[PDB]
């Protein structure tokens, strides 16, 4: 039944029944929701799961990505390595205020409400320090 629900999502992209998702199908569904990816961003996204290298996503590749999410060990390690960039002490901790600065000032910045939900979800200590390795296991569970 989980496979059938993935198939129904896959068919929203591949409305023609061709069994593939190209940049046209992916980007069309995304822009209908009000997103505006570039062509190079749509190619990068498809390339992450396109083993055949022909610029498409087929259902086996789609199902694999959906079943896996972030649960794999590669994801847990890399996310933990990203936090460690901002942990100079090396003790596995990061300050709530330092997490807030990085999340709202670097990269694809989180909004205030996004970052508020993120700090609420981490079981912050009374000092104001966050143990990010248990934060990584909650996102990889």
């Amino acid at each position: 039944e989980q496979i059938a629900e993935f198939k129904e999502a896959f068919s929203l992209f591949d409305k023609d029944g061709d069994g593939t998702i190209t940049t046209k199908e992916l980007g069309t569904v995304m822009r209908s929701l009000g997103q505006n990816p570039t062509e190079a961003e749509l190619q990068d996204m498809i390339n992450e799961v396109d083993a055949d290298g022909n610029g498409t996503i087929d259902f086996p590749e789609f199902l694999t990505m959906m079943a896996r999410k972030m649960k794999d060990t590669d994801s847990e390690e890399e996310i933990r390595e990203a936090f460690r960039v901002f942990d100079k002490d090396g003790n596995g901790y990061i300050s709530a205020a330092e997490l807030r600065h990085v999340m709202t000032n670097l990269g694809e910045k989180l909004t205030d409400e996004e970052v508020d939900e993120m700090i609420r979800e981490a079981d912050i200590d009374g000092d104001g320090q966050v143990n990010y390795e248990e934060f990584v296991q909650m996102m990889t569970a």
């Binding site: 993935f6 129904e8 999502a9 992450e48 990505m65 890399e78 901002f86 003790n91 989180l110």
Partner: protein, 333 residues
Amino acid sequence: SAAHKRYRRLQNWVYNVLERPRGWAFVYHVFIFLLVFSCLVLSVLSTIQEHQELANECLLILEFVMIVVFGLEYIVRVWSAGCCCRYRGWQGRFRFARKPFCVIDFIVFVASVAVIAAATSALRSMRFLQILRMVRMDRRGGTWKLLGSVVYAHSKELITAWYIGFLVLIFASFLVYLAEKDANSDFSSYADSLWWGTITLTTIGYGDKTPHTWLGRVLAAGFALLGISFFALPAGILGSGFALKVQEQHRQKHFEKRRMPAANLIQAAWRLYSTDTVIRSIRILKFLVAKRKFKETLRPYDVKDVIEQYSAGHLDMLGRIKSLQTRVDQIVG
């Protein structure tokens, strides 16, 4: 808990200094090393008939101070394992409840203490396992990690070296043993011949066993010229691999551009997590793009990447003129 907080902060400082070495705060490490070294020094000064009283009293005082200091160091290590609270002892339990390096050192320490209190072998083999206790550094294996990585990288080819070298050893030992079996009494057996061959091909050359006939001498010279190099390859292979790896370390640490990729990966992961089907599938794809860009900056970014983006960018350039071309042709002509 402010005074408790400050005391716990000093405690975490001492935890790092006993746990992670730094540029300057290596005095604890160097003093533990000096303790073990001095103990080995009087151990070697023993067994030459000086343990009469001057080496013996030194042994007693050093064993006393050593047992005392390692007891308190184990205490302080476990007692400062974590941060202020909930880490100091709790992730202490979390770590040592099941660890192949936590309670084993305790077992060794208590067993040696029991043996000493209630010959040379016990004392010395205890001490060298204490040099392993200072191997502990960088999780018992920093140097071991490095060496293992480099050895494993050159596996098949070290295997070539070892295997050809061992064939030459066996076959040369046999041929010289046959050529020297009658006259020379050094080559009594074939095991003697292997001893001679091992000492020769490694270029130690003690000289206790040596060919005497001209046939044996010629065979030994030929097989030496042919196998000495094979017994010296592993050092050359490993040394060159070492130097190359250092050069590459320079090359790649010159990149290290994980400022935005670092932060963006955590954001794509949080956005995906906070989703909880098509909307989720899009966030998974973006998460996977961010994880790759995050790894790439460290080391997967290479020279192939340049050409990858060249093709992409220049095809865009070719089609940019074509965008204008279609326009021109459809209107003006």
